[PDB]
DNA sequence: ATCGGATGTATATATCTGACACGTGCCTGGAGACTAGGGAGTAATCCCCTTGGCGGTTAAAACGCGGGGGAGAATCCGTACGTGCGTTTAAGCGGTGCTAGAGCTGTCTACGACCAATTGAGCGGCCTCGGCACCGGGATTCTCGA
DNA sequence: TCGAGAATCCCGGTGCCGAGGCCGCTCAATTGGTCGTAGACAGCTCTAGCACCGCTTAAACGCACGTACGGATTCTCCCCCGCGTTTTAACCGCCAAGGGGATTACTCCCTAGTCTCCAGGCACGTGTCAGATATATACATCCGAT
């Protein structure tokens, strides 16, 4: 507790449950149990690479708040638009 | 003179004028015909004409009068061209059809 | 005698006229019946435009017809 | 500051195909994130093609050649039919 | 194998198609057909109906004249011929032929053409004239292959004149095949004494073809191309000069070359007595449509309009300026083409056929038609 | 007691059908977050950017398993195991 | 044979050793008989776009002669960068 | 016996001599035909640049290459070494092209 | 007033003037900066120095002393960072980098 | 008449890094096209950034944040780091 | 496992050839030097939306325990495709000619940019009520063990 | 086939908050002028894409053998589903503080524009040598016999 809270993991915060609902909605009937910790990755993986670009536009624009529209347009460079956020 | 939008001349709910402002703000090319916002404009409303009307028939069929996005994501993906144009986007809130593979059934 | 009326949006409507109704008279039925204001009405039988200043009998229509409404939305 | 946006016009389109259906303000914002972005898609590509053929101008004939590259199959010719049929309706003015 | 198909579709003559008057009147040709030699070991094949005329090809396995050789010999064995000549001609000469040609034997396919030009030249001309009056129906192909007969001679030589036009997405010059044309013309009716109009008729094979099987009192075509307008009047010209010779009539034909169909007098004074109206607008533009429209707005009731694209843009409507336009009356009727249904590809597509109503079409009401094909979870 | 699968079945035909964000919000801010932190400034990460971030994972993420149970059955199986994934992210390019 | 030579099918032109010789670069050590069919589907499916795009562009330029360019563009759009030609 | 290779190496040997290659391995006038005819749809009378057709011909079999590439791995994902039908629609349909 | 090139300025092998006579010309903005030339000439030469060496090392591994396209697609596809930034591009006359899958080589 | 390309830079370039190392013309064309192919996207991608901003104007601010979006990590890293330098350098003289 | 036979393929020397690299004219694009506008930096202020924390509650998660159903292994069939070999096809090279279609140059006329005055469409704020969400209860429809 | 047992659907009533409609009030679209110039049309050039022919021979095609692997069947077993109980931590509604994102205002440096100067680089031409190809053969690899 120095200067800041430096957050734990929290990548298992992404219980299994939650990637079992993601699974069904996927359509799958059975998951392995290996499937959790690769999903995780996949997962930190996007995540790391969508953040990263927003985080980029946010610090070209001179702020310090990642703004819907950061997000929107870093998803939008990976060819993944995203609709309902504004664009 | 009476001022008469070009939406209205041209028959058009969408805004040709802030179509062909958007064209010239947006450095798209150092000119813009004068036709060019008016056929873009009708484009735009023609393609969103299409969408609301799928999504205001899955509102139906689910007995809903309000459009949700969870009805815009039934009317595109449910249309094998619309669904190829927006093979690449994601909706917000959309969720996914029902689908489950024939090898999943119960025997 | 019963009329039917096809609408732009797959609707029919049913009217009650004797030969003799004005087409005006029509007109103000389908106002109070579906609210529609009469100078955007249009009413075609066979292909032929109705006058408002004809009648119905004018034109020669029969028991059981079918006829077209189309709706001035904006025009030209 | 005034955030401009296509919802009207989309209130609007909605209220001619579908009289008695509303549609929600999540929605409504997808619907004007989807008229920017093939609104966006349509003038970028109208671009190109005018800066490959070295013209300063974007025509109809550029925005028809456009609409016919991205839209899949019908949605293309159906899109070009509105696009001519409005030109033909403002021109004749 | 044989170069007909014996067992293909046979088309019911409606008309007096082979002009027996003009035959019994007349036994010398006077004629002067493109001879086949002249087009860039001969043959002789001698015509079945007169004497006096001898068509020369150049007979050599190294435009197929031989293919056409076994074409014409296989219909006069087919067509022109009564029994029992028609059987001996069929045991004699064509297995003989189809053999040659299979092997490619020149010196056989020449004995074989000279053995039918003396076996012709002893039958009665009478029988045959009997024959073709009393001759109901023909193979759908022999007035194909009599057009094609009549196409090498005329536009072959100058086919590539055809390729001037300037323009990609109008102008551009493609013909229906033979085959397409008499499906549509079967599944139009067309039939004698009714008028066909064709709106861009190319070198003018719609409207021959339709004077030819189906006896329209009157045949227009309109081209604005001056290529295609001279090969045309060739073609024109040629099929006269072949259907004289073979004694088949050619009703009226008429064409308005060199000038658009639109604000054309002509074509607006007969389009209210047209029957069929032919308009291939694969690649016509928006504005010739709507050209094509304002013409055909004086169409009258039960008029068929054939078209590769639908005349009505599919998003047609009826608000204001539509009330008293003809494509409101309007059933439209899309058909598939088949494989080999046009000349500028082999794939194919689709097809309009579009029948003026007395009434509006109720299709265009319902919001179903109007969409390019539930939505529920 | 269902026979295994019956509920599984169940589950698929009511997540398909419903919309609602299946990864828990706070978890899911956390680890967005988390994986900010590797940039030292202190991010403010305006609420709708989250949900957009949650929205746009987890369209991924099912788009991803539709295609991971592709393969599963691609290779006579129902049960989607690791390496379903990396085939499915190795022909889309991601690997 | 009017105006035009029409070309026959020729999509079996992309014969069964071609077929052969593209799997074989791409690292297929046995390959099923019905390979070929669909592979020659798939490609036809994939020169479609290529072409239809190429020839819009074509169309545009008031041009008829499908420049390598063009070809370049189409592919660019479909996501599928050329390089080697402009 | 004449010497005969058993199934399987010859075609490793075809694989390392045509990884190791970079020539056209669809020749070069069926494919012309087949790029011309899949323009004949069109009515106009198309020239095909000779650089185009070349062009497109690159494109095509990299494309090829790479589905055959992605058919192989769903081959042998399945516990086979021989790609079928099944594995080139698998292969388009997580592609995004199905 | 001797004229001295801004590649000269800048160090650079690119060409600084036709690089910011091109972001004028493609209506990328309204305006280009003076110092934005110069920067994007900088990166294309880095990316068109580090394509080049290892292409230079691909041709000399090959007894080669020119450059063809397939050291293009070897020095490209056998670097990763270079491969993820032309994932998506096709090199005419490239080939494919040598490899079998192991499941495939006799046991 | 002239048809510009990045051929002798391309060349110069390649007789700093391999002195004794040719190029072919497939090559030099190819190497043409990836110049120019990524001079497009780090042009439009400054565009997009100069757009979404608000900003007329493409600074060095602009191309640097597009390397940054596009280049893959250590290629950003070494292509900002020879930007930096070069514009530095250049405003320094 | 190890030894020869035949095969493919890499090494080697020689020997072409046409594409690469270098030299030169010049001309058109880059560079130097004002000028003036306006876009962007910097400073001040508002208050919107962020953080951080709280306590309470309740759904969801985690743990653990059957058990059965699907994964993986092993066996065996048979048939489908790899590998040669002889035959057939037609692609590839290599010359020639056509001519027409892309490219460049020269009018000039329509059309789009720019600017100023006007005002009604469209966006921000604020009711307000009705379609959708929740909750209780009854009917309908698998599911499974019998 | 059946019946208890569990989801799930539906019916009704209640509640609420957000979609829809209304009211100002900007300010961006419309109208109407000119005026620069983009490009549409026409004419000319010229070179490259189409088409043809003939010969060589490399590749394709068909057929036959056989073998090895795809597919089906059967077995084991272990791990992942489903359910019950407990725990944990998300979600809520809440309060407050304040970080910094909009916003406006001012100044002024940077870049568009233009004009002239000039030299860098693109077209053209020419030497010559890196690579392609043939030939000859040592060497590595596959495969059958022992
Ligand atoms: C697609 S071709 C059809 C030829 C022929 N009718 C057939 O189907 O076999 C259409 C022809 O119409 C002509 N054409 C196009 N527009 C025309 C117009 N506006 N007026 C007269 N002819 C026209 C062209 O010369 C072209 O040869």
């Known amino acids: ?87 | ?107 | 005698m019963q009329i039917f009326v096809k609408t732009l949006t797959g609707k029919t409507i049913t009217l009650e006229v004797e030969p003799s109704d004005t087409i005006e008279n029509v007109k103000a039925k389908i106002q109070d019946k579906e609210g529609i204001p009469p100078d955007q009405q249009r009413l075609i039988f066979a292909g032929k435009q109705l006058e408002d200043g004809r009648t119905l009998s004018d034109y020669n229509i029969q028991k059981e017809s079918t006829l077209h409404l189309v709706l001035r939305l904006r025009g030209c | ?93 | ?377 | ?95």
């Open chain 5, 1 to 377: 194998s044989t170069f007909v198909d014996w067992n293909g579709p046979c088309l019911r003559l409606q008309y007096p198609l082979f002009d027996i008057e003009y035959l019994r009147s007349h036994e010398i040709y006077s004629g002067t057909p493109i001879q086949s030699i002249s087009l860039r070991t001969t043959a002789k094949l001698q015509s079945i109906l007169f004497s006096n005329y001898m068509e020369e090809y150049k007979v050599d396995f190294k435009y197929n004249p031989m293919s056409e050789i076994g074409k014409l010999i296989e219909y006069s064995c087919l067509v022109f011929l009564p029994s029992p000549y028609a059987e001996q001609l069929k045991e004699t000469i064509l297995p003989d032929l189809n053999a040659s040609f299979d092997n490619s034997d020149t010196k056989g396919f020449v004995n074989a053409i000279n053995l039918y030009n003396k076996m012709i030249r002893e039958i009665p001309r009478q029988r045959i004239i009997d024959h073709l009056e009393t001759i109901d129906k023909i193979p759908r192909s022999f007035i194909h292959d009599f057009l094609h007969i009549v196409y090498t001679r005329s536009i072959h030589p100058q086919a590539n004149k055809l390729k001037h036009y300037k323009a990609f997405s109008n102008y551009v010059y493609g013909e229906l095949l033979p085959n397409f044309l008499s499906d549509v013309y079967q599944q139009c009716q067309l039939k004698k004494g009714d008028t066909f109009m064709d709106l861009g008729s190319g070198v003018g094979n719609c409207v021959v073809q339709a004077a030819l099987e189906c006896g329209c009192a009157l045949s227009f075509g309109c081209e604005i191309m001056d290529d295609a307008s001279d090969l045309t009047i060739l073609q024109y010209e040629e099929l006269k000069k072949r259907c004289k010779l073979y004694g088949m009539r050619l009703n009226n034909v008429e064409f308005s070359l060199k000038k658009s169909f639109v604000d054309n007098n002509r074509v607006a004074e007969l389009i209210p007595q047209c029957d069929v109206i032919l308009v291939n607008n694969f690649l016509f533009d928006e504005d010739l449509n709507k050209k094509v429209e304002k013409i055909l707005q004086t169409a009258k009731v039960g008029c068929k309009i054939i078209s590769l694209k639908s005349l009505r843009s599919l998003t047609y409507q009826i608000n204001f300026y539509n009330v008293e336009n003809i494509f409101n009356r309007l059933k439209v009727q899309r058909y598939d083409l088949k494989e080999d249904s046009v000349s500028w590809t082999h794939s194919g597509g689709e097809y309009y056929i579009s029948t003026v109503m007395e009434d509006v079409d109720e299709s265009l009401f319902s919001p179903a038609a109007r969409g390019r094909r539930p939505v529920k979870y």
């Open chain 1, 1 to 87: 507790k120095r200067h800041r809270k430096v957050l734990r993991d929290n990548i298992q915060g992404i219980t299994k449950p939650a990637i079992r609902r993601l699974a069904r909605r996927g359509g799958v009937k059975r998951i392995s149990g290996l499937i959790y910790e690769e999903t995780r990755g996949v997962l930190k993986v996007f995540l790391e690479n969508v953040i990263r670009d927003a985080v980029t536009y946010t610090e070209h624009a001179k702020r310090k708040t990642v703004t819907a529209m950061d997000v929107v347009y870093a998803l939008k460079r990976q060819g993944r638009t995203l609709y309902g956020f504004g664009g």
């Open chain 4, 1 to 93: 500051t005034r955030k401009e946006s296509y919802a009207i016009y989309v209130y609007k389109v909605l209220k001619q195909v579908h009289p008695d259906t509303g549609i929600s303000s999540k929605a409504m914002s997808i619907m004007n994130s989807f008229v920017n972005d093939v609104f966006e898609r349509i003038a970028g590509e109208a671009s190109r093609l005018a800066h490959y053929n070295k013209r300063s101008t974007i025509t109809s004939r550029e925005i028809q050649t456009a609409v016919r590259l991205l839209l899949p199959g019908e949605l293309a010719k159906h899109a070009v039919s509105e696009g001519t049929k409005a030109v033909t309706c403002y021109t004749s003015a």
């Open chain 2, 1 to 107: 003179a009476k001022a008469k939008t070009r939406s209205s001349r041209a028959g058009l709910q969408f805004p040709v004028g802030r179509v062909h402002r958007l064209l010239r703000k947006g450095n798209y090319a150092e000119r813009v015909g004068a036709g060019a916002p008016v056929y873009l404009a009708a484009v735009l409303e023609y393609l969103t004409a299409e969408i609301l009307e799928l999504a205001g028939n899955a509102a139906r069929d689910n007995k809903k009068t309000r459009i949700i996005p969870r009805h815009l994501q039934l009317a595109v993906r449910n249309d094998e061209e619309l669904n190829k144009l927006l093979g690449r986007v994601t909706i917000a809130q959309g969720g996914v059809l029902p689908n489950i593979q024939s090898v999943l059934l119960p025997k």
């Open chain 6, 1 to 95: 007691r269902y026979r295994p699968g019956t509920v599984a079945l169940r589950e698929i035909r009511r997540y398909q059908k419903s919309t609602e964000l299946l990864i828990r919000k706070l978890p899911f801010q956390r680890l967005v977050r988390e994986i900010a932190q590797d940039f030292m400034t202190d991010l403010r990460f305006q609420s709708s950017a989250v949900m957009a971030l949650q929205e746009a994972s987890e369209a991924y993420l099912v788009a991803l398993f539709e295609d991971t149970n592709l393969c599963a059955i691609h290779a006579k199986r129902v049960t989607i195991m690791p390496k379903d994934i990396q085939l499915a992210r190795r022909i889309r390019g991601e690997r």
